[PDB]
Amino acid sequence: WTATSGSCKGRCFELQEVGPPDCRCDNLCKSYSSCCHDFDELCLKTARGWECTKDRCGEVRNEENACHCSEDCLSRGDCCTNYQVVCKGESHWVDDDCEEIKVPECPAGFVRPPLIIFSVDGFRASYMKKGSKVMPNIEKLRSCGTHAPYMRPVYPTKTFPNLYTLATGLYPESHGIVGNSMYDPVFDASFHLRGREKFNHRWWGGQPLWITATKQGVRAGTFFWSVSIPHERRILTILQWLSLPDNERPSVYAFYSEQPDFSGHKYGPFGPEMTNPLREIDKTVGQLMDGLKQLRLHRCVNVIFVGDHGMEDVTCDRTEFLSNYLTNVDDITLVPGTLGRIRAKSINNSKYDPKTIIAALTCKKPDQHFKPYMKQHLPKRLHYANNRRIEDIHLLVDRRWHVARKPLDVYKKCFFQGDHGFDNKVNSMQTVFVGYGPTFKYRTKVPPFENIELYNVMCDLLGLKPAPNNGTHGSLNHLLRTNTFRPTMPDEVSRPNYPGIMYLQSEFDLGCTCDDNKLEELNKRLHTKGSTKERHLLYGRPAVLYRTSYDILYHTDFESGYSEIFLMPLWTSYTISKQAEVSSIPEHLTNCVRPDVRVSPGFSQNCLAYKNDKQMSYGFLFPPYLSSSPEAKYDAFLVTNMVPMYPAFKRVWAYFQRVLVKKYASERNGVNVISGPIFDYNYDGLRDTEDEIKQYVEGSSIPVPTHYYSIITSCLDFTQPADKCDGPLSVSSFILPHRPDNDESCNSSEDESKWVEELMKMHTARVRDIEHLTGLDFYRKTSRSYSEILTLKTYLHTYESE
Numbered sequence: 001w002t003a004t005s006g007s008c009k010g011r012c013f014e015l016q017e018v019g020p021p022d023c024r025c026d027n028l029c030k031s032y033s034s035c036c037h038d039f040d041e042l043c044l045k046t047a048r049g050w051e052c053t054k055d056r057c058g059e060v061r062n063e064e065n066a067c068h069c070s071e072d073c074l075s076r077g078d079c080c081t082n083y084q085v086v087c088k089g090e091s092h093w094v095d096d097d098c099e100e101i102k103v104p105e106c107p108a109g110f111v112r113p114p115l116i117i118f119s120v121d122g123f124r125a126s127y128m129k130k131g132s133k134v135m136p137n138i139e140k141l142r143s144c145g146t147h148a149p150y151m152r153p154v155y156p157t158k159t160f161p162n163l164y165t166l167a168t169g170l171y172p173e174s175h176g177i178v179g180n181s182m183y184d185p186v187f188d189a190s191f192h193l194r195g196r197e198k199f200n201h202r203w204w205g206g207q208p209l210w211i212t213a214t215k216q217g218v219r220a221g222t223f224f225w226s227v228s229i230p231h232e233r234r235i236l237t238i239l240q241w242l243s244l245p246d247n248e249r250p251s252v253y254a255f256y257s258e259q260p261d262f263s264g265h266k267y268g269p270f271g272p273e274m275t276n277p278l279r280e281i282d283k284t285v286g287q288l289m290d291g292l293k294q295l296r297l298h299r300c301v302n303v304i305f306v307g308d309h310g311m312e313d314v315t316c317d318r319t320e321f322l323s324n325y326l327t328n329v330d331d332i333t334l335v336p337g338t339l340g341r342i343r344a345k346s347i348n349n350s351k352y353d354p355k356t357i358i359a360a361l362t363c364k365k366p367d368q369h370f371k372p373y374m375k376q377h378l379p380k381r382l383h384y385a386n387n388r389r390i391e392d393i394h395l396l397v398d399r400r401w402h403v404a405r406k407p408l409d410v411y412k413k414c415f416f417q418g419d420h421g422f423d424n425k426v427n428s429m430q431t432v433f434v435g436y437g438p439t440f441k442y443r444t445k446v447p448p449f450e451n452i453e454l455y456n457v458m459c460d461l462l463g464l465k466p467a468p469n470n471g472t473h474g475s476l477n478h479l480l481r482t483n484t485f486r487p488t489m490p491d492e493v494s495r496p497n498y499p500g501i502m503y504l505q506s507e508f509d510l511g512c513t514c515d516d517n518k519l520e521e522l523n524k525r526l527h528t529k530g531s532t533k534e535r536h537l538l539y540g541r542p543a544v545l546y547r548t549s550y551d552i553l554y555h556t557d558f559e560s561g562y563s564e565i566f567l568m569p570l571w572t573s574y575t576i577s578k579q580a581e582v583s584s585i586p587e588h589l590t591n592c593v594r595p596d597v598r599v600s601p602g603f604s605q606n607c608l609a610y611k612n613d614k615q616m617s618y619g620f621l622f623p624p625y626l627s628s629s630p631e632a633k634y635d636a637f638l639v640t641n642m643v644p645m646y647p648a649f650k651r652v653w654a655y656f657q658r659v660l661v662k663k664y665a666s667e668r669n670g671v672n673v674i675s676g677p678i679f680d681y682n683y684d685g686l687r688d689t690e691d692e693i694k695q696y697v698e699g700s701s702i703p704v705p706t707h708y709y710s711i712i713t714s715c716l717d718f719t720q721p722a723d724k725c726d727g728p729l730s731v732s733s734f735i736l737p738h739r740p741d742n743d744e745s746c747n748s749s750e751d752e753s754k755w756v757e758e759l760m761k762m763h764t765a766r767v768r769d770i771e772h773l774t775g776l777d778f779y780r781k782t783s784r785s786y787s788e789i790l791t792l793k794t795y796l797h798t799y800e801s802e
């Protein structure tokens, strides 16, 4: 109950929202059915529309009008945004040449440049070029300011997850808004776009920018607008707040537009009906910039023009139905559409079984347009698992498609021609970023980056300390003229041991066997002391950022950091030049595993465990195929280079090591490779401690990795070889799931050349993802600036076309 018979007189769009049952006048009162009786009349004025005309110039103030063209309007802060143009012979902001903003040019009393976030729903990245003829204001922001060719959304590429990721710097799994629709089993409550439960604060985790600001003494305009408040009024409200006295004026504001998304759903991303919505958004930007200029704030405010996700062509006929796969369709609840999430209809049904549901959805039709996953098997780059609100069974749906439970769901719910929600690597889901103002760079293009990074930068723009988040603070320093954040490298926590020869062959009883000169005996000794190390360890050794016990092991062809706790390398580093040759494993060495006399039997793996474990086989981190000489090849068979591998995974690994590394070395002019194991049994994206390992090689303390990574580095200038590179680096990485079957790849019974590379591409990763997963910190010794290295570590190679 609201006693809606109070009044909004002098309270219109008040910044502090008042406590029930007193009636509200804030920009969300409408959404809560709680505005005072006179809110429309006083606050949502519309008389005479939104623009000054010649005949209104110098009029007598009529308080009924939507905006004013009277003489006192500048001092009142409530002129129509085109007042000065119509009535004072001023030019529109868009018709002015752009001029570098070297320093903020702000009215007296401004403590810092204000930040205005202009967010547009469904603004696909290619709109910038394809709609450029009809978006002159946006194109001026873009060309004069700092812009990226696109910005990567988070998964799922829906509205609520992405806007809240913008506001927090957190993955949906950590902020809790994991879709537009959700069930939380602890609350036993549901969250929907329509309705009331979404207003409950217990859904919304992390700390959004407006709270970060408030807590640190920076005032914030309210970021949300009820849908029925028109755009022109949102802008006028913002411009009015900007006229408040110094002590009451916010420093951060957000505008939100539901366009072009709303139209895109109806007409497709490029439907001829889409030109008008883009025209109208541009007009709104025009109104803001003309209003800023009137207030002399156009060379003072930083403006961010940012989308939440793109939009793809999707029609009702491109719907796969679970009823064409499942006999038990009525025992499941599906969250449908551009992604699938499946749970049991009833928790009292103990005959519901996820294993058989997944199997019934796996590779059943030759052109199947979705792929089922247990959530923990999804590509790590999606970071979509560590939340009770994300169902165990997930469907990644092909771009352009929908998944639904039964055909009745679709035609008793063709309406739509566009949708979004797909994998955040998909080109059509990419969205936009432009920054314009004193704190951004002038006429600068920056590479594409992820939207999880923006919260840090918005905090920098406002002089705030960001709450803990998933951005990498400093990776977007290149966007900024000043206010950069100067990060330092994390301190190494554990220093390595450097063991020499300490054990005799006969002290080992591992059940391993192998069939195995003064010039070349000083030679082998120097290699084991680290003579070739500057060749194979190009960027310094990775730092270990947790407490552990490990050894550096040097060899002719590779260097490793060997964990005495996990009984295998944390990392193995090696360089393959363009000229290197692939050889095979000689017949007499096929099953060769050799004790490592630098490492105690007690801290080694044993061959007996693998013999006994009928499920588990083994692989090598440094590939024997790429040994530099028949004699160096013996190093590759050391028990300290060995890692546990399912036979099904060995097909993947062997193809990567035998074929792909050489291919990349040819294409990239040498590559440096760092590979290793990852353990993430609780799928939180973070390195497991030993007591978290759920699986071991049978009868042993050899822990089974959940994933294997590789980081592949070369020179960005591919005319220079990887090992002699004078400038910026180029990287691609992956985190391959360590699985006992290849069910994920529907083509796996074919030659590895038909499916393996496709799988690796799907599991492409950022170096930063691998950092979280291993507690390692890479690129410690380069000639590059740290901010540049941070940008490199956030890079994702996506394998989409242009």
Ligand SMILES: *[C@@H]1O[C@H](CO)[C@@H](O[C@@H]2O[C@H](CO)[C@@H](O[C@@H]3O[C@H](CO[C@H]4O[C@H](CO)[C@@H](O)[C@H](O[C@H]5O[C@H](CO)[C@@H](O)[C@H](O)[C@@H]5O[C@H]5O[C@H](CO)[C@@H](O)[C@H](O)[C@@H]5O)[C@@H]4O)[C@@H](O)[C@H](O[C@H]4O[C@H](CO)[C@@H](O)[C@H](O)[C@@H]4O[C@H]4O[C@H](CO)[C@@H](O)[C@H](O)[C@@H]4O)[C@@H]3O)[C@H](O)[C@H]2NC(C)=O)[C@H](O)[C@H]1NC(C)=O
Residues within 6 Å of the ligand: 170, 171, 173, 174, 175, 176, 202, 203, 204, 205, 206, 383, 386, 387, 388, 468, 469, 470, 684, 685, 686, 772
């Ligand atoms: C992306 O960035 C984020 C943010 O930096 C990273 O997430 C952080 O990771 C930390 C490590 O996992 C985690 O730290 C833990 O916090 C516990 C206290 O948590 C509360 O307080 C914080 C701070 O205000 C708050 O943010 C939390 O909010 C979560 O939970 C509420 C409701 O449940 C949600 O509204 C909200 O969305 C958020 O949920 C998300 O995080 C939680 C984990 O906290 C997940 O479970 C959810 O699924 C969801 O993703 C909380 O309100 C603290 O209690 C923990 O301490 C335990 O572990 C330590 C290890 O040092 C141990 O020493 C302690 O003894 C303690 O153990 C005890 O509890 C155990 C569990 O019950 C039990 O097993 C033991 O036996 C002990 O009794 C821990 O320090 C931090 O909270 C989150 N923050 C956020 C915002 O998510 C994230 O990792 C980054 N991702 C990547 C890939 O890098």
Ligand SMILES: O=C(Nc1ccccc1)c1ccc(-c2cn(Cc3ccccc3)c3ncccc23)c([N+](=O)[O-])c1
Residues within 6 Å of the ligand: 117, 119, 159, 160, 161, 163, 164, 166, 167, 223, 224, 225, 226, 227, 254, 255, 256, 258, 262
């Ligand atoms: O209009 C809408 N839906 C809709 C309903 C009916 C018809 C058509 C569209 C609609 C949809 C979303 C939002 C929204 C704004 N912010 C704040 C914000 C965050 C980051 C950067 C800018 C701003 C959010 N933060 C988290 C989640 C959602 C939102 C609003 N909103 O303004 O509150 C309205």
Ligand SMILES: [Ca+2]
Residues within 6 Å of the ligand: 121, 122, 158, 159, 160, 261, 308, 309
């Ligand atoms: Ca949206």
Ligand SMILES: [Ca+2]
Residues within 6 Å of the ligand: 679, 680, 681, 682, 683, 684, 685, 686, 687, 688
């Ligand atoms: Ca973990």
Ligand SMILES: [Cl-]
Residues within 6 Å of the ligand: 156, 158, 178, 179, 180, 181, 335
């Ligand atoms: Cl959803």
Ligand code: NA
Residues within 6 Å of the ligand: 610, 611, 612, 613, 614, 615, 616, 617
């Ligand atoms: Na075995």
Ligand code: NA
Residues within 6 Å of the ligand: 742, 743, 744, 745, 746, 747, 748, 749
């Ligand atoms: Na298969």
Ligand SMILES: [Zn+2]
Residues within 6 Å of the ligand: 122, 159, 261, 262, 265, 420
């Ligand atoms: Zn939408």
